[PDB]
Structure 1
Amino acid sequence: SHMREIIERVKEKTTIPVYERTIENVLSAIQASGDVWRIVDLSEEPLPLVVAVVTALYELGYVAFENNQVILTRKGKELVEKYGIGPRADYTCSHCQGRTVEIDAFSELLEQFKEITRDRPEPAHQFDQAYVTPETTVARVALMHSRGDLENKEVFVLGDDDLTSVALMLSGLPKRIAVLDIDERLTKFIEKAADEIGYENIEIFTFDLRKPLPDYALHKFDTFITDPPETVEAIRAFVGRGIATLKGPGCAGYFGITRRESSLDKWREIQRVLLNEFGVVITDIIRNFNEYVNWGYVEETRAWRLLPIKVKPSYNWYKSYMFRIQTLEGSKGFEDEITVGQELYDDEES
């Protein structure tokens, strides 16, 4: 009863749920790659859970670390063989990078975005607070336009590390754009890009999000976009605040949810929030739509700290799914005070 032993070992190391499928996913990934960052990517299990699993595996003799790779031992090869776990294949589409949309027609926008963002603020120095690639940004415009959520729409951008607002301005599509960010380096940069483009229908909000929305944000938008912190409670706050900015039925929201930091037991809870507390409908969930830029900022992670391989990731391993929602009769957002501080941003899953 090999698998049962592995499961119990991993459970000693985390409170995140552990299933056989968990082990299997990791095992499958390992056979495809020895790179820890890719293992996390391919397994689509949360980072701390992969670290727990890999640790449990090593402890029990199933894996080794050799020439800086994570690898199956003789005993490991027997294990995957016994359970019929093959290496994880992938067929992500090479032109759209799995995004479902192609950006050929936004070639000029892409280029103008890369140029204008030459000296954008540098990212915060954590792997999970990076901004998305330019291609992601432009692919988001493409998506949102193709669903009819941009042209002559009033669009609210809640947090804009990504500089989605800049893209939106270069698109010429919206009627107006509001951005909420207290990062004054961001909002200043956004202003400058606006002045440079001559775009007049942009506004900067700086209210406290923990506080009820002001009357100039409440029910005043057609579409919002946000990237919430990966906790249920932050998703409720950020997405629910986004929903509360919407006018009424027929409006759209876009946001990112990761497999890197949120287990599928957490995803279930997030989905029940959206469908029961808010009463909206999820119209799209697109795997790895969002690709985050990698600067090697992983040195605080347990993966870096406590595992013997100390190789930085060599590609944009950190990706999130695009969720699209739409409002309907009886939909609602989250309008209460957000009464938890920095604890909003972490949970039991690290």
Structure 2
Amino acid sequence: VNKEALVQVAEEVRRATGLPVGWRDVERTLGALRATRDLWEAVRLSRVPLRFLVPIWEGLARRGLLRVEEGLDLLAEVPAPRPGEAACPACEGRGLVGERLPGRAAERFLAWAKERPEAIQDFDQGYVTPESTLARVALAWNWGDLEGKEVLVLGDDDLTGLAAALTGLPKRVVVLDADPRIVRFLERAAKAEGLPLEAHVHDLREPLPEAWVHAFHTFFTDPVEGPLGLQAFVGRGLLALEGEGCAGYVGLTHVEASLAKWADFQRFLLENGAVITELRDGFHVYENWGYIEQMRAWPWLPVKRRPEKPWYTSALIRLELLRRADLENARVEGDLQDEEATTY
């Protein structure tokens, strides 16, 4: 198995789908399989979109490189680097530990997390682990984006708004979500804990209400990752920032976003006056959601077994505005999911 075979597998997928599939996607796919036979683990190790993985794995099996039977088994030696093992086990490779947050936020958060609303398919939900939420807020603490600040959270199954308000740092936290269950849980917690936290039912496909335009110092979001979803979550966030010196925090996966789309998103940030100051890949680990067998890619999977441990992860990005972002505050029409999206 030589280099050209990786190139040819990628070109085949490219020809069949119109998607930006490269030879290095194939390399990554093979690399992961040097370390595991389990499909979900292969996804986690690969750093390739699940939309790409399926036809790549098919192409590799058509060439006799891969056996697809109860597992994914490499049948040949391959020109692909094996996954490294250098993640710091103390912080799960984050660099940040949420346990250190003020106000005993970590212990108080874990109590509330035990009663959180289940992730539902109606809103593409799937929350990160409590440690992930707390570390996300710890990053914001470290960069000075919580204390005395006005914080907006756009979608909050992760309960970032709650963790942030439990630290005792923000001036106030406002959460928007389409799901009344999330809104109500946050309002309940806000009342019981005496927090300056408010939550509102709002669908981000509609314009942002004028009270929230250029009114915040800091936003958090873990958005739907089609370009329209990026616009509706991250563009609203940028519109919500007062301007220069304000910060945003964004969750971004490989599972549903190609490196080509990573670049497009980075261009979108730079052209709207932002700059990236942190990008910690694999920072968030997601809890398995109940609706996995009803998601888009399920029927395509070569092995179909419910996952028993976490597999879906995302990066944390920190951005800062160098000037006010003057984005159109229009309705977003059309699908927030794109062709790369597979777990909705």
TM-score normalised per structure 1: 0.90
Of stretches 184-193 and 123-132 in structure 1, the one that deviates more from structure 2 is 123-132
Question: Letter of the aligned partner of 2:215 in structure 1?
Answer: K
Deviation at 1:307, TM superposition (A): 4.1
* SS of structure 2 residue aligned to 1:54: helix
What residue is the counterpart of 1:272 in the other structure? 267
Tell me, in whole angstroms, the C-alpha distance in 2 between the residues paired with 1:298 and 1:13.
26
Cα contact 2:252–2:315 (8 A) shared by 1 = yes
What residue is the counterpart of 1:232 in the other structure? 227
Question: Letter of the aligned partner of 2:282 in structure 1?
Answer: N
Tell me, in whole angstroms, the C-alpha distance in 2 between the residues paired with 1:33 and 1:319.
17
Deviation at 1:223, TM superposition (A): 0.4
* SS of structure 2 residue aligned to 1:344: coil
| Matching residue within 185, 192, 197 for 1:196 | 192
Question: Letter of the aligned partner of 1:299 in structure 2?
Answer: E
Question: What is the aligned length?
Answer: 338
What residue is the counterpart of 2:304 in the other structure? 310
Residue 346 in 1 paired to residue 341 in 2? no
| Matching residue within 280, 284, 288 for 2:282 | 288
Cα contact 1:127–1:297 (8 A) shared by 2 = no
5 Å-filtered alignment, 1:323-338, equals 323-329=317-323, 331-338=324-331
Tell me, in whole angstroms, the C-alpha distance in 2 between the residues paired with 1:211 and 1:5.
44
1:62-112 deviations in Å (ceiling 9; x for gaps): 11034x221112xx32xx1xxx32322231111111212123423932221
Query: Structure 1 residue runs of 4+, over 6 Å off?
Result: none
* SS of structure 2 residue aligned to 1:195: helix
What residue is the counterpart of 1:60 in the other structure? 63
Tell me, in whole angstroms, the C-alpha distance in 1 between the residues paired with 2:340 and 2:287.
26
What residue is the counterpart of 1:144 in the other structure? 140
Structure 2: gaps of 5 or more residues: none
Of stretches 14-23 and 130-139 in structure 1, the one that deviates more from structure 2 is 14-23
Of stretches 4-13 and 137-146 in structure 1, the one that deviates more from structure 2 is 4-13
Deviation at 1:205, TM superposition (A): 3.1
Structure 1: gaps of 5 or more residues: none
Cα contact 1:37–1:317 (8 A) shared by 2 = yes
- For the aligned residue pairs, the C-alpha RMSD in angstroms reads 2.2
Instruction: State the identity as a percent.
Output: 43
Of stretches 157-166 and 116-125 in structure 1, the one that deviates more from structure 2 is 116-125
1:123-178 deviations in Å (ceiling 9; x for gaps): 11599631111111111121100000001111011111111111122211101111
Tell me, in whole angstroms, the C-alpha distance in 2 between the residues paired with 1:203 and 1:171.
15
TM-score normalised per structure 2: 0.91
Question: Letter of the aligned partner of 2:176 in structure 1?
Answer: L
Relative to structure 1, the CA distance from residue 96 to residue 4 in structure 2 (aligned partners, 3 Å threshold; closer, same or farther) is: closer
* SS of structure 2 residue aligned to 1:192: helix
Deviation at 1:12, TM superposition (A): 4.5
Deviation at 1:292, TM superposition (A): 0.8
5 Å-filtered alignment, 1:16-95, equals 16-66=19-69, 68-73=70-75, 76-77=76-77, 80=78, 84-95=79-90
